[PDB]
Every structure is written in C-alpha cells, then in structure tokens.
Amino acid sequence: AFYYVKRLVGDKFLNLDPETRTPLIIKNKYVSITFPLARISKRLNFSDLYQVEYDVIPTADSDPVEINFFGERK
Amino acid sequence: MFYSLMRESKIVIEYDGRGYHFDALSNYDASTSFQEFKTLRRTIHNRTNYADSIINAQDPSSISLAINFSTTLIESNFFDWMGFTREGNSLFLPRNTPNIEPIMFNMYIINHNNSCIYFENCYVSTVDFSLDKSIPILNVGIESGKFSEVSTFRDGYTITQGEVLPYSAPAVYTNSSPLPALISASMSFQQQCSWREDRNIFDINKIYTNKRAYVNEMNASATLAFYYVKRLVGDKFLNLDPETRTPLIIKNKYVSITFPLARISKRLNFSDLYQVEYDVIPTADSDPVEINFFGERK
Amino acid sequence: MFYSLMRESKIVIEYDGRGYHFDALSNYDASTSFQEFKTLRRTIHNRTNYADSIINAQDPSSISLAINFSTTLIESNFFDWMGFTREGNSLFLPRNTPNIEPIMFNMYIINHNNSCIYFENCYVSTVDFSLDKSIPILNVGIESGKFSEVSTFRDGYTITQGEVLPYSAPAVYTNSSPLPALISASMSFQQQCSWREDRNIFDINKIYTNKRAYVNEMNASATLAFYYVKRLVGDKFLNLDPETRTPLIIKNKYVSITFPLARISKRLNFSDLYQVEYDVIPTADSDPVEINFFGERK
Amino acid sequence: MSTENRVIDLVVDENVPYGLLMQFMDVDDSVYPSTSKPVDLTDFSLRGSIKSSLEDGAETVASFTTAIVDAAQGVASISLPVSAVTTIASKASKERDRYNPRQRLAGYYDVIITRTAVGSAASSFRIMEGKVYISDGVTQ
Amino acid sequence: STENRVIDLVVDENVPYGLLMQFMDVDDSVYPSTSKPVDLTDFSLRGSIKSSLEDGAETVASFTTAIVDAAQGVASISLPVSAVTTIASKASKERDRYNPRQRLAGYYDVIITRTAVGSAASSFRIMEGKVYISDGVTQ
Amino acid sequence: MSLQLLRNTRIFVSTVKTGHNKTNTQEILVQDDISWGQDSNSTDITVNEAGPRPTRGSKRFNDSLNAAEWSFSTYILPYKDKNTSKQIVPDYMLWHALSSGRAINLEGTTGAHNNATNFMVNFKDNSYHELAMLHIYILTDKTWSYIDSCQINQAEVNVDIEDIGRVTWSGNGNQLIPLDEQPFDPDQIGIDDETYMTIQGSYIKNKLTILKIKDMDTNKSYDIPITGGTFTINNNITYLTPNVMSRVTIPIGSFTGAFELTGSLTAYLNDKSLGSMELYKDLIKTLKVVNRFEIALVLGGEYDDERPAA
Amino acid sequence: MSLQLLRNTRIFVSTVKTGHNKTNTQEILVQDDISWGQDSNSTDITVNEAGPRPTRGSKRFNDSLNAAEWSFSTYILPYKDKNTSKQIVPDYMLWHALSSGRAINLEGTTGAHNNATNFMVNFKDNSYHELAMLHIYILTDKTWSYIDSCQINQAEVNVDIEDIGRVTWSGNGNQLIPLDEQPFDPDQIGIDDETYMTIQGSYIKNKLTILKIKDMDTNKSYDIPITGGTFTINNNITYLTPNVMSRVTIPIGSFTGAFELTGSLTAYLNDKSLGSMELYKDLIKTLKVVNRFEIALVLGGEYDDERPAAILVAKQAHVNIPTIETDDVLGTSVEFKAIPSDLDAGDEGYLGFSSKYTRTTINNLIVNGDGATDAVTAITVKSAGNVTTLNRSATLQMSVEVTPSSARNKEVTWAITAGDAATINATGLLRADASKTGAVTVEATAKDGSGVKGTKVITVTAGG
C-alpha cells in the first residue's frame, strides 16, 4: 500500500500501468523478502489522500523467492 | 513530491465538447483496477509453484458522486444524460427506452500540478435522493470503461453549479390531499445498462477496455415512510390495502416528482411508534413520470 | 389524529374461544407485507419502462414475543399449543408428532381508540429461553397466514399473567451429581412447520392468504456452556469424549427441563479462560423430554 | 473528442547530449480505417527556450537547437548540445529531493512550430510545454 | 520494465573488485522475448566515483573499463585493489542502516559511447547509484 | 481607535431586516451573562507513512461554519402599556417566536396574545417546521452587528428563591453579520424613562412562590412549600448546514424538534396532612406507568391585592 | 537513611550513555513542575459463573510496561558563550532533538544551529522516523537515575503576559533505569556561576510581546496588541511495545507522527485602522477554505538597543475564522497553524533566539531567515544618466540603488504597472515605439521577499 505520488507530469517510473517483470524487495533491518521478478498490479483509491495498492506475485520463470532472517547486525 | 488530496480536486464531466464542472460536490468515491488471467500449470512432470498471470483487461470503474442541489440546476443534466426526455425544466420518464445504447460521456478528476485521471465511455446508471429532514443530496452512480492518466484536461470555468438551495420540508400529496405524518421520502431512478464484453483473439497480448453497452431497462421508484396514523375507526383513506392506481406527488419547494398513476404497496412495522412504508412504482399505462426542477420562486 | 405507540398496546391470543391476554410482555416485534408479481414486458415493438405489477397474496407474518415467566404459568400454553402433551404442570415431548397440522389460533394486538391488527391462522413455531445470570425470558415465534384490521376485538380481562417469578440461579445435574462451573444454559424447542401454498387459477384477481400447514418435525434441544474444569489427572467424569446416553436435567427453582437420555457433544474453546460447550439432544429411544413449570414452592 | 497531452516534462542527463525527435502525422477517421500520412515539413521551423520561471522577467537558462530530420517521413528533432546541458545544470535549483538526489528542477520550456512565407499566413502553434529536469551526473 | 539504471555497488575492503556486465537486447514483440545480444563495436565505457553530486566534488576514484567478447555483448568494469583502498580511505564513518558493514563512499555512473561509428558521438549513461565500501576483517 | 466594553451592549429583537419601527423592534434588557458568537469547523490532512525518512507535514482546510450561538437573561417584567392599555411583557416577541410559528397577532387566541387583564402564552399553534423568525440586533458601544434569521431554541426559567424572577433565552442563527451603518436609531426604538418606571414598578420575586399540585386520578390537592426549582420550554431546534468540499458553507434552514415542557421542583418533607411526605408515599405506593397531575407554579405569589406574577 | 526532596533535583540531557563530557551533556535548569515516572499495565482474570455456589476469585498478571513519561519547564535564556562567541540557548540539544533527526551540528544550516548573531532552529530536516535520541539524567539529592533513549514529543510555549518567557518540554522514554553509581561528576558538567550570571543578564518577558501578521493574499499588515497566547511544536510520537503473554515487555522503538506547529492568540477588538476588528471582519467576510498569512510572534519586544527576544516565524500560515470572546472587554482569538508549501518540504516555520536583537536584526531574520544576513530596506530606481523622460523609439536601461549596502540579495525584478507605452526586459532595457503619448511607470522589487518598492513615473512624450 502506497500513497499516490508522482514526481513528473507524465511520469514513467510511477504510474498505474502493470509491470510484467520487475525486481522487488520488501526490506527491513531484520528481514528481507525478495522477488527476483515480480508481477505487479496497481489499484488506485480516491480516498482522503490518494492511495495506490500493489499486488506482487512472482512471475512464471522467476528465481526462488527469498526470505532472509537477520537476528542482529544483519 | 506531489501528493494528491481529495479536498483539492475538481471533477469536470465532458459532454458534447463542453465541460460541466460539477461544483457543490459533497463527496465522491472512485477506484481503478485491472483484470488478470492467473492459471497455475501444475503437471506430473513439474508440480510448479509459480503462476502464469497476464494483465489483459481493465476492470470497469464504478464512480459515485454526491452532489448538492444548486440554483442553476446543472444537476438535472444527469437525468438528461441518463435518458429522460426534456421539456422546459421538467424531465419525463419515456414510455419506451429511446436508444439501445446509453448516452456516453467522458469525465475528468483534476488535481494540482497537471495531474488528472481520465474516465472514458461513462454512463449514468443510478440517481437517488432522499427528501428528508436533512439537506437533500442526489448520489449519482456512473460506470466507466477505460481509465487513463493525462497531462492536460478540460476544466469547466463557466459551466458550474451555483449556490446550494435552502432546505425545504418535503410533502407528499394525493391529488391535493396531503398525506399525514411523513418521515422520509426516498426517490430512486436507474438506467440498468450492461457492458457487452467483446474480448476476442485479436486482443491477445493487449489490454482490453469495455467500449459499448446496452440498456436493459429504465425505471422510476420511490419508497415512502410514514407513521401509522388513522383518523377514523375502519378508515377507508388510510389503511393497509394495496392501491392499484392512485395519483401521487412527492413535492418540495424546489423539486416535485409526479406519478400520474402509482402502484402502492404498504408495510407495517410494530416499532416504538408504528410505521407504515410505501413502495411506489408507476403503473403499466401510467403517463410519463415527471421530475420538475425549480431553481427559485418555482 | 391517533398515533400508535408500542408501549400502549395489549396482545391477546384467541384460542378455543377464550382470550389469553399475555401480560408481563417485555417486547414484541411484528410486520405485515404483501406479495407482488412484477414482470416487465419489454418487446422488440416497444422496449417499455413500466412494469406490470399486481398484488395477489399476503406474505405470511413473523411475530416474535418476549414473555417473562409468571406465577400463573399461562406461558406454558405456548408449549401446549406447540404440540407438547400435558400431565399436571409438566409438558412432555411426544415420541411422534400427534397430528399432521399444527394447532391454529388467532392473535390480536390491541391499541387505543378501537385500533387493532388481527393475525389469523397462527401457530407457535419456536420457543427458546436461556437460563443464565440474568432474568430468564422465553422468546416465542409464531407465524401468521392472514393479517387484517378490525374495529372490535377480544380482550383478556381475566386470563392474564401474574407477577414475574423472582430470579433463581440455574443448575444442571447428571442424575444427582452437579456439573461444576456453569455459565449459560440455553434451551430451544421448535415445531418446524411449513406453509402449503395452494394458490390456484381460481384465485386470480384476488388476494391469497395461507391457511393450512403441516408439521415437518418437532424437537427439543439445549446448548450448555461450561468452564473447562478438571479435578483429576486423566479424569473420567469430566473430559471431551462424547456421551452416547446420559441422564441430564437443567434445573431451576421454577422450571426443570429433563432429558431421560441425552446425546452430548463437547467443544473446547481456548479463550481467556477455557470454556467447554455441550450440545444436548435426546437420544433415539429416550423417554419423552420433561418440562416442569413450578409456580411457587415447587 | 479525446484529450491532447501538450504538457510534457523532459528529463535531461548532465554531461550527456539530449536528443528528442517529434513526428507529425496526419490522421483521419472515416469509412475506411484510420489513414495516416506523414506531414510534409516544408518551411516548418521550430524554436524553443527555457526560463527558470513562468512569471515575466524570468532569466533565460538556455535555448534549444532545432532541426528537421526527414520531411517526407514528417520527422523533426528538437535537442541541445552537451555544453547547453552543462549550462542548464549550472543554473538549476540547488534544492535536492530525497529518494532520488539526482533530479533537480531546471525551469519551464515551450516549443513553437511555425511556417513563415510570403504566401503563408503568419501562424504559430505551441506544440508542447512543460518543465525541464536534470539528472545530475558525476562523470566529466 | 521501465527504467532500472539505479543500482548500488557494494565493494569489499582489501579485495579487488570486478563486475561482469552481460549486455543484452530483449524485445517483447514475440511472447518468448528475443535474447539477441548487442554487438560491442566502437564502444567505450567511462565511469568515475565522486563523493556527492555538488559541483567541484573531488574524484574519489575512476573505473577501469574492459571490453572482452564483443561478439556476445559481455563487458567488464573493474578497478585495482589500490583503487579500493583509496575509496575506503575517504568513505564516511556512518554505516548503512540495513548492513552495519557498508559505508557510503560516493556516487558513480558509467557512460557508453559510440565514437564516429556513423559520424555520431552517441554517448548515453548506462547505470548509476551509490558505491558502498564493506569493511573487511582479514586485513 | 477604541475598545468595546460588554456593559454598553444593547439588544434589539426584530422580525424584519428593513423598515424598523416600534412594532417590529424593541430593546431587550439583558444582563451580564449575555453571550453570542459563531464557531467554525476545520480539518487536518496528514500523511501517515511507515518507511524511513517519512513525510511529516499537515494541511488545514476551512470546511464549514457552525450555527451562530446567542444567549442572554432577562427579568420577567409584566406591565400595562399606555398606548393599548393591555398587559404586555417587554420581550413579548421572544415569547411569540417561542410559542408559535405564525405571524404575531396579540389580538388573536394562539401563541403570545395579551388582554386588558393579563398577558398569555399558549403553545396550541406550534406545529411548524420553522417557528416565527427573528433577527437579533446587537449594539456594542458604537459598532453594530446582528444575527441573521434566528430561532428561539429554548427559554430557561430558574425558580431560585431569595432572587428575582428571571428567564434565560437561548437560540441559533444562520450567520452573524457585522453591520457598519446604523440600522435604526437606538435612541427612539429603545425603551424610554416612562416605560422604565412603569416596568420597575413591577418585579417578580422568586421567594413568594406558591405551588398548586393536584392528582387528577384521586382529586387530592397537596400543600408543598417549595425550596427551589426550574422549568424549561425547549424546541430541540437543529440547524442544517450543507457539505461542500470546495467552499465553506453556512447553515441554510432549520427544523424544529420535539417540544418539551419539563420541570424540577425541590421541597422539604412535611409530615402534615397533604404534605410532601404524603405525595412521595402515594407516588411510590401506586407505582403507575402514567400519572395525571395538574401543576400550576405561581411565581410571585397570590394575594387579594394586586401583585405581579408569572 | 534519608528522604529525598524535589527541590534538590538536577536534570542533565545527554546523547551518549558513556564518555560524558561538556559537549554531550549539560544541565537543564528546571522548575517546580518537573515530573517523571513510568506506569505499568495489568489485567484481572475473573471466573463468571451462573449457578449456585459460584466461584468468586480473581487473579492479576503484570503484562506490559508503558513508555516513561517526563516533563519539565525551562526559561528561554539566550546568551553568548565565551568559548565560541556564538549565541546559544542552554537547552540547545533539546531544541535539536525537537527539530531534526540528524547528529547535532551547530555549524550547519538545519535543525538547531547557532551564529555570531543569533541562535536559530528550523524544521527543514525532520523527515525521520526516529529523531535525535537523548538520555535524560535525573539527580535527586544523592541517588541517580535516568530515562533510556528519550525523544522530545513536544515543546509547549505559553505567551502569558506579566510573566517570564518559558517553555515546557514533554516526551517519552523506553524505560526509566535507576543508577546506583555516579555517571559523571555533576559539579563539573553543571553550569558554573559565570555562565549563570551571563544567563540571568538575559531574560525574556512575555509582556513586551509584539505580533506581526500580514495577509499574503492582500498585502495587509495588521496592528494587533496581544492579550495572551500559546504556540506548540508537536511531533505526535507514539511508542510501540510488544505483546508477550509469558513475560512483561517494555517499549522497543518508536515512530514520529505528524509534525504540527499550531497556535492561539487572544486580543481585544480595536476599531482603529488595521486593528483586530478589521482582521476579524475580513476573515469572516472572505470565507475562504485556505488562508495565506505571515505570522511572526516576537517574544521580548523589538527595540533599537540590544534586547533579548525569542521569535517564531510562520511564512505560509493558516488562520482559522476568528470568534468574539465576550468578556468585560470584548476580544477575539486568532488560532493559526503553520502549514508547509509542500508536504515533504518541511520549512513550516523556524525560530530565532538571541540576547542581542536590534529591530533590523529581527526584520532580516523574518524576511531572510537569518539574523546575520542583511536585507534590503528601501529602493529608489535610477535611470541611465539621470534621465527624467523619454521620447518615441528610445531606450532607457534603468539601474537600481539599494539600502543597506551590505544586503545579501542586491538584485531586483522589473515590471510595468501603470500605462502601456513601453516594455522592459529581465536586465531592465526599457524599449518604446511610436504612437506612445501617455505616462508610463516602471517598478522593481527585490528577490529576497523583503517587500521593498522601487517606483518612478517617467513622462514619455510624442517627441519634438
């Protein structure tokens, strides 16, 4: 879940178009789930502040999804 | 960077090449989404875990607007676009649906810094407002086929809604005899269209957007809530028997929905104070349902 | 004019030509409605917008009463009317349903100024009360076939409910061994009848009202809630194993529901404090389920 | 009936020449399907300028060099040399943005295509507009 | 897809660094995307590591470009262990949040270039990001 | 260049926004506790992120204005005017706008209507969604202002013995509007010294308060000497304001609620016949869902010679 | 064997748990209202039966500890230190931990940073989920204790006239830890008598409070003598504590909320020009969803000679619709909130503290952001060669002279306001043409936002 943010007029990086394959990682100081290739679908809600919502699943030929478990100091 | 606030927005409806900026907008809700075809090809060779998902269509959007009544009566165009015939400032419900396809229009949702969302191939599918002891407001519901992001847009500088109409108590009549003890008169009008999905093999590897639709039916309806009141023992005027045909009008100082002949069904609730509820629909051979829009001084 | 307040009402049940005015009524809920046949005849000639709706039947009413226990035990007549056999002040659940059709009675809901609503062809379809740490109350549920508005009525001046019985803590026994840590004992009894719709072509252009019904089944049920308590390690008396046949009684100072042989199923919830829940139904060959009604001093 | 997109925001790369080419195509919707023929750019010239602000009196950061690549295919290219990129980089706003320190706002730009001849009408046309951003580079 | 030029390099202390770029040209017109590699002729890569983006920033180091196997498109960017030491000397003392071994050393970008292959200097940036030194223990 | 003091406030009640004369506007003698104003609503839109380096910024929007609040206290001061020779209370249009939703007609028989004997107010004609509409005019020192289209929400009357008979008015208005020019000359419309003498001749003292209570189901009149009490006339009027996201809005119309006439009466327990103890014991012994009592609270006392009373 | 009195408490603010020196820890002069502590949560598990002879027994479990609460009040006491000769407030690290989430650097330009002229605090670098982290050390008589990993939740400043300028701090900590051994010698770290004399030389009196409010949409400065007010710097910091059923837990980390800079200002209604009445009437007549006001609350007053002062500046503020406060003397309340130009831009407002503010210093603080950077005060525009007129088809490249001569921004813009007989470029090269027989004007304004006006009426004629 994001806030709908655009930096340019007609931006290419941040928009609502689907992304067939893109490397994604949801990182923390103690855990990091890695999608080597991801299929992202976007959904915009015209709420109080516009919010976009992603739907990330690994692609057909994507490498295995990583889940790292860092105890302390990575 | 640029965030997008709902309060800092402007909704402009593009019809016939003119922009109808609908000010006096209390609240609107919208969403955009895509349709996927996700299949998992688990085989005896490889019991895989990774699906085969491709985005191939845009799910139709469902935009709902809540618009206050205004003195310039731009909001009656929603009845006009939904299919009602116009004579002066009164909108008729036609005996038959005029055309197979609804009236299509585009809509913009403007925001600061040239940001916009462009809904296309829209049609008004629902309009209902409740005449009650609060300020009346009509919630319109439109369905889009294609949504897009555009840089420049259409902004209705001139065509705009005026000041909101002052509150006035509703009153429902039979001919000219008032119906006592009104609680809440809710009116509903619909254009129950349906999308004609024509996704074919020529659209493979492409994103499909709905474009054409047909009208299944139009209707005018109203639900009236009263308190169970009787003036006589064994009264004939006020009772629970159904009324096959009776002239009804839900009147206000600024709007009056007229049913030349109505089919009324009654429903009694044994609540704290007994309440009867009507279900008013026009009859088979009734004359067209009237919707008058009085700005000021009728 | 005359408004109708629920607090200013009187519910009288007419059975066998005598009026059973059920005082000590905490709350009742009822509704009346009609059935319609609304079809839209859209044709290639005229794609019309006006439906063809005719009111032809009265939807059966569902009246629910909440009645406090009373010292004169008029409320046991609901078990009597629902099908239980009577011996003294105890009601038996018969092994077989006595008759095909239930016991039919009429009911009035009186109000001031000769106002009344007349429910006819009623039958008691549900009776359930929860023996708990609050004052017990049995919610009865009756279904009507025909409702009407009448001027004069039947008012139970003499047959009435007395003073409400004082609260007394419930207790469930096995033979004479108490079951520890009771929370809430809820009992349920039903007469699951079904309306036999016989609307035929001789009723065209007329309003049809259901008149006859047949009993699908009768049953007695109880759901018991305990705290998971064990007195020994590997206890045999208190555990989670099912009990095919065991004598149970949910006893109070004024009522005692007896299952001569019961089929108990247990369910454990790992909540803040562990709770076990029973599901008590009489067995196949069990003797008739008892329901005793003690007014005072047993 | 649809909308245009005259507002386009450009992003240049520091120390690298920037090249943008525009193709003008004639279009029509008729009984036969959409027929497109390239517009012949004869006597068609372009001219674009960049200023740090919209308000009058804004400092001119730089100007674009205009050229026509292929008249028959209706292709015109609008670009600036690397030295102009450096000039715009020097005059850009120093305020950075987190999550991407590279981009900085440089100003606003416009492009007018005109056809000037004795027999031709004195007609100009603002084909585009928008803002110019800079992707700061470290090499060179 | 879109653009993914921004990738951060984590170079190791006391160890020489070498990166192997398999240049490629994927096209998604046909459903199985074409695996055609670009052909590396008249191509040179240049990259400098400079602390901060402000003008006049000191050049922390400079990448050493290697072009090998031009037919199949691959190429190598590297820098000697002495360059690694010079980078690690000027790195900031503040450590990265996610890894307590990395320290921000500067910024970088490599720029491809065609030198008069068609009488055109078609030079554009390939990639960019931040360079992180990873503190070693062996030496 | 001047400061404005509350002590120099003067309040005029009007039914018209123009053509102000002595039959449409009169001064209302108010006290220290007078208060008026209008509040505004707002909203803060804040971004609530979760990542490092989050955005921490807010933004405020004015969205609506609330209904104007006004309140003041006045003394119950019945008297007879020289012009009509009919007993009238100076704040009679306040009583009318409280009582009925029709045009004021003292000659009639509903709402606030007077007589050669007494001034009377009955609520037999208050079945209206919008009662009689007033306009409170406020004069503080030199500057003028007024509240547009007011409605009398309630009238509090506190029976506080060893104090004078007083009534507290409350209400709401569509909008408070400051006026730069004088609407009408306050010297002429304001009450003159002669009527002031006539009014101060008549005061109602809450101490001399007799109460007459009778059980209509038993025909039992009780003798209850009061200690302190209060009764209210409440309309439960709610003001409706439209919701517009692009522009701030002020209330547009109102709707009267349920008319309530409640009270509370404190007294000592008396063992004498038909005293407080007998009433209390009868009420707690009957335990009836509904009661039929006749209550006649007489402020100012009853006497053979002429005395003021409410 | 001793009782501990609150009057003997001494508070030290630290950024390190070891190696305490004079640059990491300083004493904070607190008042009577100091308070600190930590509360604990519990739960009762009770059996609720219904039968006769029910079980009536309860049981308590300690389940979690709440975040430690601390609060104290301090006087705003700007002064210059002898070591660095830069104006600094004694509780400067509190201001830094309130302002920014980076390491303290008084030499920088964000957060709490000082100068040879004034001490300044701006919130341009507060985009952090965990601001600068402090450790409050408490010394009561002989025993020691401290709160671990504190964060400055807010700073209340009450403008209470006939009282001294004071600020109230509040915050939360992970855990309150009692220390048996002395962490550092409080005699050395605590402030000595010399700096105490220097501080008490400078006090800020809330009575001498001038306010500068200007409507940016209309260019209307108002003269509002204040009666009483307050402004807050709030972080809305919430402390997260884990839920474990088997063991009690203490908060582990926090997350800053939405940064709010609000205020409330009470004043009497004035009928004079540009008074309170005019502001109230304008605000209730416009009825606008958004307002753009410039508010500069100047505690301690403005004077030609050097005086102590604390200044809050809100460049783009939002003012609520005022209301009239009916008292013995009629008044009003001006509730405002400093909003940023963009949400992720910061710069909602800033503060400047010093014991030496001449009027010019506070003016250039307000219009330039720093008390040291001078700002233009007046302009008279000059032509090319002391020319008084112009004829048709003649150029006039006009120049500018500015005061003071040391202003940082000496440039101006160019514009034509009255008449249509000439055009000007960015540089100022005015150009005319034929058929120009009217009087045209020229204007210039500085780029530092001072509000300086440069005007000249050139009498352009048709020529000889």
Side-chain angles (χ1 to χ4, degrees), chain B residues 93-100 180-181 215-219 227-234 239-240 242 263 265-274 281-284 286-289, chain C residues 1-9 28-34 36 38 40 42 45-55 109-111 113-117 119 147 149-151 207:
Chain B
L93 180 81
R95 302 290 331 247
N96 317 326
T97 301
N99 316 325
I100 307 170
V215 190
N216 293 316
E217 68 184 2
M218 294 162 69
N219 49 6
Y227 284 112
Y228 189 49
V229 296
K230 292 177 71 68
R231 44 211 311 181
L232 312 173
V233 172
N239 44 7
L240 292 193
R263 197 270 312 156
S265 179
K266 290 144 194 196
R267 171 175 291 93
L268 182 50
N269 303 296
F270 290 66
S271 66
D272 204 343
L273 195 67
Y274 293 10
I281 73 162
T283 81
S286 170
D287 293 312
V289 165
Chain C
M1 72 291 291
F2 320 127
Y3 296 71
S4 302
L5 285 85
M6 201 185 78
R7 291 198 49 102
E8 303 172 342
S9 75
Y28 75 95
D29 167 82
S31 288
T32 79
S33 55
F34 289 87
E36 71 163 359
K38 176 212 73 193
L40 187 67
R42 285 175 78 90
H45 295 246
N46 313 323
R47 296 187 295 262
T48 197
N49 290 352
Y50 291 69
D52 290 290
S53 164
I54 62 170
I55 301 299
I109 296 174
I110 321 292
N111 202 337
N113 309 326
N114 289 272
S115 161
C116 177
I117 301 279
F119 295 103
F147 60 94
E149 308 192 325
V150 288
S151 302
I207 297 169

Side-chain angles (χ1 to χ4, degrees), chain A residues 30-66:
Chain A
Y30 306 109
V31 64
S32 70
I33 308 105
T34 300
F35 297 83
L37 291 167
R39 197 270 312 156
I40 298 188
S41 178
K42 290 144 194 196
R43 171 175 291 93
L44 182 50
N45 303 296
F46 290 66
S47 66
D48 204 343
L49 195 67
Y50 293 10
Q51 295 199 20
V52 76
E53 212 171 346
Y54 290 15
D55 296 87
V56 192
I57 73 162
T59 81
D61 56 350
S62 170
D63 293 312
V65 165
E66 213 65 26

Side-chain angles (χ1 to χ4, degrees), chain B residues 1-3 5 7, chain G residues 289-290 342-344:
Chain B
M1 72 291 291
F2 320 127
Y3 296 71
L5 286 85
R7 291 198 49 101
Chain G
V289 286
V290 294
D342 291 331
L343 293 176
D344 61 291

Side-chain angles (χ1 to χ4, degrees), chain G residues 388-408:
Chain G
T388 174
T389 180
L390 198 76
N391 72 84
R392 295 198 271 201
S393 74
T395 60
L396 209 53
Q397 179 255 358
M398 293 177 71
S399 66
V400 71
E401 62 91 26
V402 287
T403 181
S405 295
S406 177
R408 217 179 57 80

Side-chain angles (χ1 to χ4, degrees), chain D residues 14-51:
Chain D
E14 194 186 13
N15 296 115
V16 161
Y18 178 78
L20 185 80
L21 60 91
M22 312 145 58
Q23 165 163 62
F24 310 90
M25 292 215 58
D26 188 336
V27 298
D28 186 33
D29 300 324
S30 182
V31 183
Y32 44 79
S34 65
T35 55
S36 313
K37 69 197 71 84
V39 162
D40 178 83
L41 282 72
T42 304
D43 190 23
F44 283 3
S45 70
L46 279 69
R47 60 181 178 90
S49 170
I50 305 166
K51 268 165 271 303

Side-chain angles (χ1 to χ4, degrees), chain F residues 74-76 156-167 203-211 226-231 297-301 308-310:
Chain F
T74 62
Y75 286 137
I76 313 175
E156 185 79 30
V157 182
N158 189 32
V159 179
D160 175 315
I161 69 179
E162 76 190 3
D163 171 349
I164 309 182
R166 184 181 41 141
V167 58
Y203 266 105
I204 304 182
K205 315 169 189 66
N206 284 347
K207 170 83 68 169
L208 300 168
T209 294
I210 190 167
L211 189 148
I226 308 311
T227 300
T230 179
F231 68 91
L297 184 62
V298 186
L299 279 83

